[PDB]
Amino acid sequence: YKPSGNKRVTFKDVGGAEEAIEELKEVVEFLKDPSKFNRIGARMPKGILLVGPPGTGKTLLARAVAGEANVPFFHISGSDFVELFVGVGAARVRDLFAQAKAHAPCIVFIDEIDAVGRHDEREQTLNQLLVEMDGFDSKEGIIVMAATNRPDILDPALLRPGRFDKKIVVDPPDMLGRKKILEIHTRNKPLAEDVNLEIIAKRTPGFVGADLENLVNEAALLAAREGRDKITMKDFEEAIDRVILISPAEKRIIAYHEAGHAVVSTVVPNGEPVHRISIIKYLVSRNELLDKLTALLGGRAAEEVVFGDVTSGAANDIERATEIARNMVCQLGMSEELGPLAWGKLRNYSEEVASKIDEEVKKIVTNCYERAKEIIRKYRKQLDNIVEILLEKETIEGDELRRILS
Amino acid sequence: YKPSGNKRVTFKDVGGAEEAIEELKEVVEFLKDPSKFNRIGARMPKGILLVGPPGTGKTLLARAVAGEANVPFFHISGSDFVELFVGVGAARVRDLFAQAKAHAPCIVFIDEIDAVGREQTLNQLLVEMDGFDSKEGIIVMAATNRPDILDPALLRPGRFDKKIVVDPPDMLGRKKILEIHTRNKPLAEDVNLEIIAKRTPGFVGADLENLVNEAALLAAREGRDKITMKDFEEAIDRVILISPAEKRIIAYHEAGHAVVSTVVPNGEPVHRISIIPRGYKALGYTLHLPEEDKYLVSRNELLDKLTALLGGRAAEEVVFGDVTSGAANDIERATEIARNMVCQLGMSEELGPLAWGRNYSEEVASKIDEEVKKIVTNCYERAKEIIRKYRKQLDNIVEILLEKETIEGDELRRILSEEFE
Amino acid sequence: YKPSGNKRVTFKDVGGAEEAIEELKEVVEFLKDPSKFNRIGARMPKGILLVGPPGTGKTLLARAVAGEANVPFFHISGSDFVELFVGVGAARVRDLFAQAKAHAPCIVFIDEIDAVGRDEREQTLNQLLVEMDGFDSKEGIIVMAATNRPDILDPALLRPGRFDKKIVVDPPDMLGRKKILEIHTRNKPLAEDVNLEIIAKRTPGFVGADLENLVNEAALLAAREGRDKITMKDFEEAIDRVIAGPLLISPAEKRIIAYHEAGHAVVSTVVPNGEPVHRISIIYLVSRNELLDKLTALLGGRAAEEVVFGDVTSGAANDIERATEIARNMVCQLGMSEELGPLAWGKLRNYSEEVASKIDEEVKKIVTNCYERAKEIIRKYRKQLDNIVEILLEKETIEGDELRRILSEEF
Amino acid sequence: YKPSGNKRVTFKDVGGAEEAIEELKEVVEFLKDPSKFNRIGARMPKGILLVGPPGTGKTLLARAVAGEANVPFFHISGSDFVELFVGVGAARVRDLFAQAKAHAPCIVFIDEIDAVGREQTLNQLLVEMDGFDSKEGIIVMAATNRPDILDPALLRPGRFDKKIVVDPPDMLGRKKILEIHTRNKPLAEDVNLEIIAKRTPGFVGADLENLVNEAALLAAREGRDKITMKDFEEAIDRVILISPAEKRIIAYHEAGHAVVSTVVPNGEPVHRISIIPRGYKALGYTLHLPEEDKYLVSRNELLDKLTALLGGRAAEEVVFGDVTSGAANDIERATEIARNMVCQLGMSEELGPLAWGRNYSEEVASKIDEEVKKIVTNCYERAKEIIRKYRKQLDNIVEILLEKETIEGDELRRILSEEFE
Ligand SMILES: Nc1ncnc2c1ncn2[C@@H]1O[C@H](COP(=O)(O)OP(=O)(O)O)[C@@H](O)[C@H]1O
Ligand SMILES: Nc1ncnc2c1ncn2[C@@H]1O[C@H](COP(=O)(O)OP(=O)(O)O)[C@@H](O)[C@H]1O
Ligand SMILES: Nc1ncnc2c1ncn2[C@@H]1O[C@H](COP(=O)(O)OP(=O)(O)O)[C@@H](O)[C@H]1O
Ligand SMILES: Nc1ncnc2c1ncn2[C@@H]1O[C@H](COP(=O)(O)OP(=O)(O)O)[C@@H](O)[C@H]1O
Ligand SMILES: [Mg+2]
Ligand SMILES: [Mg+2]
Ligand SMILES: [Mg+2]
Ligand SMILES: [Mg+2]
Ligand SMILES: [Zn+2]
Ligand SMILES: [Zn+2]
Ligand SMILES: [Zn+2]
Ligand SMILES: [Zn+2]
């Protein structure tokens, strides 16, 4: 167990993970100079858990932190510890941490943690991990980062405060994100001037960083195979087939549905501000609830208006919307005719009341539906622009959207 | 869990399924050394779904694959998870796969997969499926005679994306199965398995294995050392078809599904139709399969799908003037879809974009029924307009069907095209 | 199972929880020296149940009691027991208590008890029951358990001889938030502009966990900019952060809650058979008239809402439930209805839809009448209503000879 | 089952129940040597039913009897049989009595006897009761605060044919109970149990034992060796009555039951009335007791019994103009009897001699409700005619009741006679 002798990486080498980079920048500030936190009692987490599917750059990330703070990086694999003789596992964990302390500040990284953080010698090995986590002085500038695509496997003792109580979700990249990852893995290659990375991004939905690096490589091998000294656009185009889904008709629909939720939310006075759209309170008032119900129905409202047809897409929204309305009527005393009474809780009321409840509930949801439809029809052109962008980029930010709603 | 200690089997021991053996020979080549495929990027399926009626050797083939690759075989049963306490189901799925990997390469078999694939237990299954590395030499196989009941999420790519249909065996296939289960039995000279295969129409492997045992018993009863032909003749009658007027109806029912599906604009492409009593290759079954390609479905798609479902019955009524029990399952499926349109998808006129479900009044209960009946009826009457309008094509397709029994690929498409060009 | 290896704490580390601390003082003295009680046969409970929302310091109090008594503390989580294989749970409980006895006096603390005490879970719990019944209080063992989900507990756990004593741990009001900040600040360098009062006042809804995190987020903001002191701006900004990471009460909402609570207060006072009202805070044989009064008061918060703001909020949902429980009980049990007569309707309903319909009407009529009567009262005493709210928004909690007199000067 | 290993108790340890001790001193004389009674044919009861509210020392007395006769004591709990699987209940009753006889003479105690005496489990109990030989020195004792709920078959002669009522203790009785639970405790000189008894109205034994413990705890908390008077004062407030306008109402309610019962021709003789908060000696409770004398009951008897049940409420309304929750249990009992008349006894006009019970239509459900309401209402209005007609007597009975609190025997009868002669 020694400082990794692999190539230095920084955040300049990670594409499509800005949210995560931002969370890790404070960890980097800390490794470069722990005293700035220590002297005012700013406590950092001892363990950070990176969650995400394979090849999304969980490891890259860990390595970038180390490289950016210019600090050693210990890379361990959790699948190493399975299958060990009796005791050997604990002893390795002990030695790992002993080393980490000799070399602090530093990052200790445990890949595929689920493999050890899960019924025999694993107990021993894991218990030791737990003891060492509890054991080390954060102030020393030690941070253990851990990665998994399988977080529901993990022994909850690992996620307890003082341990791995910071999770950072690392998702598959959107279209811009994939464009950046191509930039990165292309830095050092000879590209022809016809290579359009945006188009390649557009044509690689679902690809993760690991897939894109592969694609670039297949591009390069293709040109090389043919005795050429620049990689061209036809090479990347051909490559994509090599490293290899959802209709474009279906993409359209999803986009309008999502744009729908967003437009209504924005327009409705009490809506929830929209932080992001993607195609991959304590007290609450009557008006608040109606504005939310209405937003909830916008997806469907936008399908009906734009396509005339409706899809199964809004099943969950309808359930949600209905639930709210039933609650307004039976628990929150917010109905016209039924009064400030609690109807139900099962069913402790008559068929006459059962029927009134259904009318009121129907009345509320129908009224909200229509309202959503008016908003969509009223803002059709901007809905269309939003969709126009959303289809291209896959995700769009609120500030942008509110803008387009000029 | 602990791998099967049941006697190893090879394809040597499976008769009447040469088509299926074919497709699985690759899997065996993979299990024996996954490195040859790995090295050049040959990506195998993570899941294979065995479809066919009971006693057709689904379980057998699975084990034949495992024996043929001399790899361990985990047999799990689908009905062993239903009925379990809170969580037990998931943790058993967990354990399953934990074992699978420790013994890779290996085959995990999940019989009666419909039992689990109709919350927690499945969700877990799904996550394991996508969680394991194909390249480690793990292939999960599953069987079902109820493919129509499975959650469409199981058939998504990266899961049970390939499926093999295992049919009841015809006369020649029955003879082979008889020969296999008679290998280590003492036959009289007079015994002619040929005639026995001919005289056992409809029998599957399981039933034939059973007939054979019943023959042995007749011999033993009398204290004899050779099983005679009389013993086989007599046995058939202990275990105990279709008429050339009933053949017709089946023909018209299946043609029906075909014609409506072709004509209706959102219909499911038709790749094969068949009148083999219970082959799961028929279109009648296919129509009952869950959508594996799309996530979204539109109201018109459903109306078209509904109308195809009722095409078999539409045909029977138009052509025969009455109706048979044949369409029970189509009716049940049609009705589920209607209810779902109305109570979950908000696809009804009068009921609005509301989720109903019971949570609601008699007065609503009644509108729902009215609305569901309306949809199915209109769809039924559409199917009949179509049948009548395309009666000649219907007649022509039956004529062939009666003769050929099963129409499959490039040939099926010539005929639908000639007929609807 | 071993005693915890975390830092020993005391009541010097708990803030805003004086009532809970006072009930727990007995326990501390016991654990310091059980003989003192055993000497005169003062029987202590075997189990104390701490009830309250997440992050209010249920775990902290328990630790605080152990720390104050300088006795070992076993920290167990109920969430560990569910999901376990056949038997392993029972055997764990058995080990857990074996150790308890070998380290006694001591505290065994079971967080999230509702996870075990809501096949196999049955056995696991059964085993708990056995051990509880099975240990000698005299030997200085106390089992404490936490939950914010008490209604979900099996009543077997609450039997005498088991978890037969409960302490409720409330969320902190202004002054309590103030103290929690001072505590989590003891050892940190604050700028001279930092006013924890103001920050207290801006963090209604915040529990101890929330505030401690607040302070750490303030520290991280200073540290990130390389500053050697935490400033007011850091706390102010931190609030907005803790929020968007994982409920503050808005000022608009504070307003509504105030009127709601002031409403109950006003109606209760005015109504002849009202329940004396000892405190307001933002955070046998009864007669019909008594019941209509009680009903009227229960609806006062909602009435104050409707009258003052026009709108109504989800905030009266439980009051509505309770009011309805009362009206049904008047109609279906006490024979206090106009038209339904002196009959017991129900006991589970054993009556026609025709009656069920009359009942709903009669229950609706009672509640509606009391609600309107609540509004007549609010409107009639809008002035005093407004004065009570004004004060309440200043202090958040009004109590004692101070609430005593406010109600007098006003009525 | 195995006899109690709990500390032996004597009457020395039971305070405030001298009346009950009296009646049980005979039982003790019997247990110590059943031969003295046997020899001259003195037949003792086979069952004694202890009635009173919880924490009044019912269980205690049972054990006091057993300790005082130095005989074994089997404590069974009624709620231990409900919830048991098919048969388990009976076989446990069997075992119980099998043990009883092997250890005779002895006392079998069955707490919460209502729990079992509201099929198989009771039926078995009944047969054992009558199955065992009194003369073998076996007396079964049972307790309940719910005598009204018991099957009248338990109170039949040869069973629990004698019952003792245990009341909450008045001030003097509370003082004694305090003195007992303080015997082996270290009291400060200033401690005056007198004042404590006076300041604890309504407290039962259980509650007083508890107050005492709470005092000890206050001492221990502060590390003190004597429990002080402040400690008792403070304790009361930790554990925590009737008004002279509420006293009135209770008075009028109980008078009510009395007046209607006397006037109504089939009424249950009235032996005592009482306003002690919850003495089970009140007529209000008595009326709720099951008929132990007769097997048959006639429709008019029930109507009269129903009318007496509503007399308490009739009184409240007539005299006060409104009504209180006081009559909830009377209403519930009245209604059960009405339903029973209509759905089981065939005692309704419109419904005929039919058993309804649910097994029947909404349309019947409705007539039943109409009919039940009719009966109870008519009976209620009869009770009011009576109250109003006998208002003066009602007033007179209250006057006494307010003063004396409990009227018992020869005296009660003088006054009812003077008043209704
Ligand atoms: N976001 C990314 N930006 C740039 N390269 C990436 C990214 N994600 C993955 N890659 C490339 O693919 C390789 C595999 O990524 P890895 O860190 O092993 O992913 P994970 O740890 O999630 O399995 C990385 O070394 C990197 O070169
Ligand atoms: N194709 C076949 N050839 C020979 N024997 C067969 C065949 N199919 C089934 N059998 C016999 O009958 C049994 C079929 O049962 P099973 O394996 O459960 O098939 P399924 O999964 O289709 O129900 C086998 O165990 C085998 O003994
Ligand atoms: N009343 C309080 N005073 C000081 N700190 C508190 C308080 N309540 C919570 N905390 C802080 O937040 C943490 C709360 O966690 P915990 O005690 O687990 O709450 P609970 O058990 O109610 O969920 C404590 O460790 C403490 O640091
Ligand atoms: N009359 C009494 N005198 C002294 N102590 C009593 C008396 N009644 C009850 N107690 C105390 O309180 C407890 C009463 O509980 P229990 O025996 O169950 O009575 P019950 O059967 O009426 O509930 C007794 O165990 C005893 O310690
Ligand atoms: Mg990886
Ligand atoms: Mg089968
Ligand atoms: Mg908690
Ligand atoms: Mg009792
Ligand atoms: Zn949606
Ligand atoms: Zn069909
Ligand atoms: Zn309220
Ligand atoms: Zn009464």
**Domain D169-240, second-level architecture:** Orthogonal Bundle (1.10)
Site to probe by mutation for ligand 3, drawn from C60, C186, C210 as the one with most ligand atoms within 8 Å of Cβ, is C60
Whether B405 is a known active-site residue: answer no
Sign of CA dihedral B392, B396, B397, B399: positive
Q: What angle do CA D264, D269, D275 make, to 5 degrees?
A: 100
Angstrom CA distances, D246 to C98, C284, C326, D169, D242, stand at: 55, 10, 22, 20, 6
The pocket of ion ligand 11, defined by CB under 5 A, consists of C 301, 319
Looking at the complex, report in whole angstroms how far the Cα of residue C325 sits from the nearest Cα belonging to chain A: 9
**B17 CB near ligand 2 (under 6 Å):** yes
CATH 3.40.50.300 is held by the domain D1-168? yes
Residue C351 contacts A where some CB pair is shorter than 8 Å: no
Cα D16–D19–D22 angle (5° rounding)?
Answer: 120
Identify the three-state secondary structure at position D19: helix
Q: Do A312 and B352 touch (CB under 8 A)?
A: no
Is D421 in the C-facing interface, judged by CB distances under 8 Å? no
User: Alpha helices, DSSP H only, in D264-361?
Assistant: 283-286, 299-309, 311-320, 328-343
**C208 CA → ligand 7 middle, Å:** 11
Q: Would the CB atoms of C311 and A350 count as touching at under 8 Å?
A: no
Give phi and psi for D81, each to the nearest 5.
-100, -40
Q: Distance (Å, rounded) from C-alpha D132 to C-alpha D93?
A: 13
Asked if C54 and C247 touch (Cβ cutoff 8 Å), the reply is no
- Resolution, given in Å to one decimal, reads 2.8
Q: Which atom of ligand 2 is nearest to the CA of B60?
A: 17
**Residue C308 CA to ligand 7 centre (angstroms):** 37
Pull the structure tokens for residue B146: 């109820």
Task: Using DSSP, state whether D107 is helix, strand or coil.
Answer: strand
Cα C164 from Cα C152, distance rounded (Å): 16
The burial of C130, by beta-carbon neighbours within 10 Å (0-12 exposed, 13-18 middle, 19 or more buried), is given as middle
Collapsing DSSP to helix, strand or coil, C142 comes out as: strand
Task: Provide the residue ranges of all domains of chain B, joining segments of one domain with +.
Answer: 1-168, 169-240, 241-421
Tell me which residue has tokens 């998994």.
Answer: A148
C-alpha–C-alpha distance, residues C202 and C191, integer Å: 19
Strand-pairing partners, residue A75, are A109
CB A301 within 8 A of CB A376: yes
Tell me the count of C-D CB pairs closer than 8 A. 112
Query: Is B284 assigned to a binding site?
Result: no
Judging contacts by C-beta atoms under 8 Å, the chain B residues touching residue A326 are: 359
For D132-136, which contacts have Cβ atoms below 8 Å and span 24 or more sequence positions? Answer: D132/D46, D132/D97, D132/D100, D132/D101, D134/D43, D134/D44, D134/D46, D135/D34, D135/D38, D136/D34, D136/D101, D136/D104, D136/D105
Strands B162-165 and B138-144, sheet pairing: unpaired
Residue A261: closest CA among A381, A386, A400: A386
- Our mutation pick for probing the ligand 1 site, out of A24, A60, A183, counting the most ligand atoms within 8 A of Cβ, is A60
Are C27 and C65 a contacting pair, CB within 8 Å?
yes
Written as one string, the DSSP assignment of C1-66 is -----S----GGG--S-HHHHHHHHHHHHHHH-THHHHTTT-PPPSEEEEE--TTSSHHHHHHHHH
Identify the CA nearest to A309 among candidates B293, B353, B297, B380: B297
In CATH, what number does A173-244 get? Answer: 1.10.8.60
Q: Computed over its alpha carbons, how large is the radius of gyration of chain B?
A: 24
Residues of A in contact with C349 (CB under 8 A): 348
Other CB atoms within 10 A of residue B91 CB:
16
CB-based burial label for C353 (10 Å; 0-12, 13-18, 19+): middle
Chain breaks in chain D (C to N over 2.5 A) after: 118, 240, 357
Q: Look at the block and give the residue holding tokens 């007399």.
A: D311
**Residue D122 assigned to a binding site:** no
Sequence-distant (6+) residues with CB within 8 A of A62 are A50, A73, A75, A107, A109, A145, A147
Look at the domain C244-411 and name its fold: Methane Monooxygenase Hydroxylase; Chain G, domain 1 (1.20.58)
DSSP letters for D216-265? HHHHHHTT-SSB-HHHHHHHHHHH----TTHHHHHHHHHHHHHHHHHHST
Give the separation between CA A215 and CA B90, rounded to whole angstroms. 37
Architecture of domain A245-406: Up-down Bundle (1.20)
Look-up of token digits 């004529």: B399
Give the residue, by CA position, lying nearest to ligand 1 atom 12: A210
Q: Which fold has domain C172-243?
A: Helicase, Ruva Protein; domain 3 (1.10.8)
- Does residue C299 sit in helix, strand or coil? coil
Q: What is the CATH number of domain C1-171?
A: 3.40.50.300
User: Annotated binding residue at B217?
Assistant: no
Q: Is C319 annotated as a binding residue?
A: yes
Q: Give the other-Cβ count within 10 Å of B265's Cβ.
A: 7
CA separation for the pair A121, C199 (Å, rounded): 50
Count A/C contacts: CB-CB distance under 8 Å: 122
Binding-face residues of B in 273-332 toward A, CB within 8 A:
294-300
Give the C-alpha separation, D54 to D64, whole Å: 17
Residue A56 neighbours by CB under 8 Å, 6+ apart: A17, A170, A171, A172, A173, A208, A209, A210
Strands C47-51 and C73-77: what pairing?
Answer: unpaired
- Cβ of B143 below 6 Å from ligand 2: yes
Distance CA C73, CA C96 (A): 12
D107 contacts: CB under 8 Å, gap ≥ 6: D31, D62, D65, D66, D69, D71, D72, D73, D74, D139, D140, D141
The arrangement of strands across the sheet holding B73-77 comes to B73-77, B106-111, B138-144, B47-51, B162-165
SS3 for chain A is CCCCCCCCCCHHHCCCCHHHHHHHHHHHHHHHCCHHHHCCCCCCCCEEEEECCCCCCHHHHHHHHHHHHCCCEEEEEHHHCCCCCCCHHHHHHHHHHHHHHHCCCEEEEEECHHHCCCCCHHHHHHHHHHHHHHHCCHHHCEEEEEEECCHHHCCHHHHCCCCEEEEEECCCCCHHHHHHHHHHCCCCCCECCCCCHHHHHHCCCCCCHHHHHHHHHHHHHHHHHCCCCCECHHHHHHHHHHHCCCCHHHHHHHHHHHHHHHHHHHHCCCCCCCCEEECCCCCCEHHHHHHHHHHHCHHHHHHHHHHCCCEHHHHHHHHHHHHHHHHHHHCCCCCCCCCCCCCCCCCCCCHHHHHHHHHHHHHHHHHHHHHHHHHHHHCHHHHHHHHHHHHHHCEEEHHHHHHHCC
CA distance C93 to C76: 10
Counted residue by residue, chain A has a size of 406
Ligand-binding site membership of C36 (annotated): no
Cα D173–chain centre separation:
19
Q: Alpha-carbon distance B162 to C102, whole Å?
A: 61
Residue of C79, C80, C83 to mutate for B, most B C-beta atoms under 10 A: C83
Mutate to test the interface with C, among B1, B83, B84, B86 (most CBs of C within 10 A): B86
Let me know if C175 is exposed, middle or buried by CB neighbors in 10 A (0-12, 13-18, 19+).
middle
Do the Cβ atoms of A19 and A50 come closer than 8 Å?
no
Enumerate the residues of chain B whose CB falls inside 8 A of the CB of residue A323: 355
**What's A1-172's CATH class?**
alpha beta
Task: For residues C328 and C318, give the distance between their C-alpha atoms in angstroms, rounded to a whole number.
Answer: 15
Closest among C201, C296, C313, C295 to C259, alpha carbons compared: C313
Superfamily in which the D241-421 domain is placed by CATH = Peptidase M41 (1.20.58.760)
Peptide bond connecting D105 to the previous residue in cis, omega within 30 degrees of 0: yes
Residue B362 CB: number of other CB atoms within 10 A? 12
Check D254, D268, D316, D371 and give the catalytic one.
D254
Q: Which of C261, C305, C306, C362 is catalytic?
A: C261
C208 lines ligand 3 (CB under 6 A): yes
C210 lines ligand 3 (CB under 6 A): no
| Interchain contact A25–B (C-beta under 8 A) | no
What is the rounded distance in angstroms from the CA atom of residue B332 to the CA atom of residue B377?
Answer: 13
